[model samples]
Target: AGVGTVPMTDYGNDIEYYGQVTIGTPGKKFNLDFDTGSSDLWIASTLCTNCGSRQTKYDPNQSSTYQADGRTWSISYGDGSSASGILAKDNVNLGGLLIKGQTIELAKREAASFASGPNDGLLGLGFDTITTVRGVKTPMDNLISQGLISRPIFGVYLGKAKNGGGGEYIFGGYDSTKFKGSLTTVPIDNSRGWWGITVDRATVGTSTVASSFDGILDTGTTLLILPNNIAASVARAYGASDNGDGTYTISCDTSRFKPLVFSINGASFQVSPDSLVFEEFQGQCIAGFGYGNWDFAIIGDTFLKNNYVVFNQGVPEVQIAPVAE
Candidate 1:
């Protein structure tokens, strides 16, 4: 299968990742966060009132192929960030590949959190079952139907965590050179419309944390969110002191931390010690573990940098492997 590649940039201290996408007839280019947590493709429109001037707005009048649909679309996150607008049909371009008659959400109104980001909008990579715009096919789904994607798979390499120096998102195939060893293909449970996978167990070095757990691989989420008790278990095990806030404070010394392991599909993967804690200041650091709103774990971008992942929509399976050094 041929691969369609897109360059991704890391923003907000490697917490968010976004890439460029072309839309409409003449193809107006805009940056969109490649969010795996949600399923909707929305962009700020020229009709947006509360948007920044630097934010690229999609002017429907500029595109000859733009066809307005009367349906309305709105989506809100746990953080209260929201975007809403009308739905329309247009051509979308990803790495020179064209997806004709793709559904696009035109955000006429956006929350403050969205106006400040480097991205003009978000491109969701989750299952279509959970999309905000009901009955509308997602971008990837249309790509598959149009034969734009030979293999219903897309792979991600997050690159350097500092500035996202050299990462790429490959549609239709995975880059073998970016990862080492063999791939572990894990069956996913997308019942709730997420890239959910089963975890055999969790551990800190040799010490056990949980017997079995299920987690979602969400690039949109920044932290490695866990259940409340599990967060406490991990924090206390790492000798971290509760900061009275939802977060925990720990020593910046990497030696004090263990390689957090999440064994999946009989393959054991270790989360590097350095990736678990972020230094706040001199001699002090903050742990990335915290409680999420959901019952299952949210595997965020922090751990994604350490592994190369392949999301296969056809088989609905997720393939994981350690990223090459």
Candidate 2:
């Protein structure tokens, strides 16, 4: 199996982690957020008048290999931002591997929220069954189906905020140098089109706060999202309270709190103090946890930064281990 390493660049707050990729004929470059929480690939198009003229856009007319698809696609985010567009086929280059005729969703219209982002577009690595393009197979799917990669697997290692944040993705296999200890592999519940897993419980140090839940490993998201009550339990443990501004006020001293640990499939993956204590707000720290408007707990980069994740898309399982020092 051939392996390819794609270098990742982390944005402010370590929320947006993206990498470079080329799409269409002559390899037009675009930096895309390689998300594992969803299954859809889209880029802003030259036809999108509202996308702003300051950023990169994919012009299909300039691409000789582009093929128009009659079907359409759209994505409505929880933040009220939406993107609507049509589908097409073109070559996308990832980590030196060329995937020809990969279906790509080109946005004809997008919200203001998208136009201000740090990257050019999004590239979902999640299951193809949930694509908003009516189940259109993603470029990652073509990476497997077309036999461009030996293993339908990839490893994620997000960098720490203290280091100014940068990481890499190991496609087709995991990198031994990226993590420490033995990995714990768990069965995934991709029924909801996520890298879903069952959580036995969540604990603050030796104390249990919440019991039994379902969660997903999401690289696109920045915070560890939980329900209101669960988030409150963990925040309250550190004498934190809701700031009423979609964030919580916690102790500025990160060392004062215990680690937040999630028990999953007989393994414990914990979140350190640095991941819990975030940007300063009014002399206090902002708790990194967000309220999950959705039912599942979202294990985003807030936890993944301290851990290395491996997804076996071929067999549909996920492996986890703490990142090496």
Candidate 3:
């Protein structure tokens, strides 16, 4: 019954939530984004010539446990950001749980987006099938294969940043006290690396504005990115106007709006209007939902904050339940 839990802190303005991990023999610590959108544990390295504003670069040469595999690695994101690096193995410490000779990528070059981000790197929680690193198992996969955890399950809870609080990331099992009611489990689409599911319908007030949409639960993304038409419909329902920059603007008075509901397998999950609103800029609150070209909706932190989510690799399903009041 081995379980590991770690505290996650909200990044600037609730853009992301990050946790710490230690690497190498001496345990060099770094803040990493616990992203479920991709597979691969990568960090900026001392070999990088243009790491931009990143202050913490992992020096693999300084670690006695470092073992270079001499393989090149590269990954590109939907946001036009990319990174390339070398493959290596080292010891990894996750909230006191040690993983020896864990496969990791050390970035030698990165795009401006990652270089300017606050996180030292990203720890991917998605399935190993989607990993860009060929013939290598993900850290999570190794955990289960090595019998480091009793069950191949993990959970996440992201607190409201405005309230000056954070949340928890639990591995092996979930804390029942963090959520109310039983978890609503949805099967994952194994064809894709993401935690993808088919949404039945989206309702606002009494109207069902969208149906039969593919959606992915991505912790790496900050906003709920929907198809342009769906995003437009959702914005209009809340009296929001498209800002022409992929974002929508709405009045600060959230009480005037109705709660948005997403139906999955005949179950309705509600998202309050306050959760749909993003940080204010220039005296106007922007909609947390944005327009994107993706065929599947990207359900990000904005939607996750209002729900307690369980990512179960054992059954390859995502379980959701409302947060306790």
Instruction: Give the alpha-carbon lDDT of every model.
Output: 0.85, 0.83, 0.86
Considering every candidate listed, which one attains the maximal TM-score? 3
Q: What lDDT tens digits, residue by residue, belong to model 1 across residues 28-87?
A: 899999988999999999989998778999999999999989999889986779988899
* lDDT tens digits by residue: candidate 2, 12-65: 778678888889878688989998977788999987878956668999999999
Stretches off by above 4 angstroms in model 2 are: 1-3, 281-284
User: Model 3 residue 288 lDDT?
Assistant: 82
> How high is each candidate's TM-score?
0.95, 0.95, 0.96
Off by over 4 Å in 3: 1-3, 52-54
Between prediction 1 and prediction 3, which has the larger TM-score?
A: 3
For 1-325, candidate 3 gives per-residue lDDT tens digits of 2247878989876789998889998968888999999999999889988786645888887899999897999999888999999999999888767888899999999998888888889999988888997788888887787777788888888887766758789887787888898889898885788888888989999988787799988999888889988998888788889889888888878987888899987777877788788778778898888998878899998888888899988788989998776
Top model number, lDDT: 3
